[model samples]
Target: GTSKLKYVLQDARFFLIKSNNHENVSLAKAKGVWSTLPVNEKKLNLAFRSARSVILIFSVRESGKFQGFARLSSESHHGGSPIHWVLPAGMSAKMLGGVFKIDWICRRELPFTKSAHLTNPWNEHKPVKIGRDGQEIELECGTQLCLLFPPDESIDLYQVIHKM
Candidate 1:
């Protein structure tokens, strides 16, 4: 019997590094304005081990405030390392809101055999918000992963932009 491929946060070493945590933050409860929490760290459980590069999806909560993530950084992005990233400062009264989704865009030549990876660069799947409004649609990891691979065009549509 083939089981449905679902990504539960159980085994995935992915999380936002904030200050408080009364209980374990499950995927369902991963919401709220991030910059206010002073997110200084984050975790990553790469959806695919082959992911050459990963893009974190950010959306503005209020209008014309967020300027998108400007300068990003990480301490240990070296090999076999605990490779991670630091939350940069990008606020126009707050250049942030919710972590909507994530995706891995690999621009290399790999046949189906090398990439039984299932999703990426194709598979017209999900993600349908411009990330301009405050309604944070916290998509599941799997859905986020799927949403990311479709078109980098829509993603890079003047991301570091502002609108009134």
Candidate 2:
């Protein structure tokens, strides 16, 4: 049987970091303006109540006990197993989200081939939104992975990634 492929918090982290500016104090939650929680002291889980769409940022942590994570309703991500990443402990990470919760290295996690890491990069799939607005926002990860933000609606966009 075939299975589906999905990403970790990396997608959401990279998307938020590059899409918006950083802030020292946590603000803007009341105005519907989402804020990316700082990852300096303790590991902060950037969560939303019924998020319209979850953008997994691309982060990579080389040496840190608590890197970063996205709180996805708690019920969605847990499947009687743990999630693992492919980032080294002390290496240079291109994207900030890549290392925290690396790809699920479980047998059930791998899609088809070991090299076929599937995502919505080609706009072939749709995201599972959980908010009333029913909105989706594409984001950029790093300098190397730049693309058009909010891919044209003319082409039936699922999501778009870019650099900021």
Candidate 3:
């Protein structure tokens, strides 16, 4: 079997499957990145303020099965948000976060005034905040967090994909 993976989005949820050894993070731990408020508000604020750029992940929470992901960096200092590619039934999206499909990269430079939004049950799109672990944003289902770092002088490629 070849070492390849796919991710898909359905019914306002994302899905992923891999044909190799990998680790799957749970909704609580994954979403906790933002939902779990920090002790010091300033620290959280610093996380977003200092973030070079932010990546937004999309996913779904199904017991024993979840399809999800977060934002990715791009080569161009000013990366454009990726196209919302749809996934067909029985077809999975390339896995991100793991050794899969470059974490569904949507590389783009952070806007001075940025916002991440997810529309379905609860419409939540607010300014992002920076903190210790990384920059994070809040959502109804879970939270999204991203690491702070300068972009490399490359474009349309995958680098060290970090999640904390």
Candidate 4:
């Protein structure tokens, strides 16, 4: 049973590409805070820091527009632990119109269902306008995660790993 669970965990790993012709995101850059990967690249590895169910938000490059999204819901032996998104062969950016400007957000817990997750995709293919006056882009969940334009670049990717 333990071996099977491990297999499932490994199989759960999948890829979401902007398209086919993109290059792998530069490992040197993605390793940086709020990493970046080339659009249309291969599978981007995300290793769970914990066993708890998690969600990932791939926002538009340099803008708040949410692009791709995925939910890695964990259960059983891996329940209630943290996971990390790793790039085995480095990483790359997903380009829209041959340009890439994207950032990502990863958090623990399933804030919304899979159906709602599919409903929101890249603000109808347009960049989400951010203003200095302050704005809020609320999610179906109670709290809204903010991705400031021109991000600090020194932000923490993930907090301390939780041990269950």
For each candidate, give its TM-score against the true structure: 0.21, 0.21, 0.20, 0.21
Please list the C-alpha lDDT of all candidates, in the order they appear.
0.25, 0.23, 0.27, 0.27
* Candidate 2 stretches greater than 4 Å from native: 1-46, 57-79, 90-164
Query: After superposition on all CA atoms, how large is the RMSD of candidate 3?
Result: 17.6
lDDT of 1 by residue, 13-38 (tens): 22212222212112212321223221
lDDT of 4 by residue, 86-148 (tens): 433444322211222222332221222222433222245222232211111223220122221
Model 4, residue 146: C-alpha shift (Å): 10
Deviation of model 2 at 90, angstroms: 6.7
Residue 136 miss distance in model 4 (angstroms): 19
Query: How big is the positional error of residue 122 in model 1, measured in Å on the Cα after superposition?
Result: 25
How does residue 1 of candidate 2 score in lDDT?
Answer: 10
lDDT, candidate 2, at 68: 20
lDDT of prediction 3: 0.27
How much is the lDDT of residue 23 in candidate 1? 23
Model 2: how far residue 9 lies from native, Å = 17
**Cα lDDT for residue 107, model 1?**
19
Candidate 1's C-alpha runs over 4 A off are 1-39, 42-54, 63-150, 154-164
Error of 1 at 11 (Å): 12
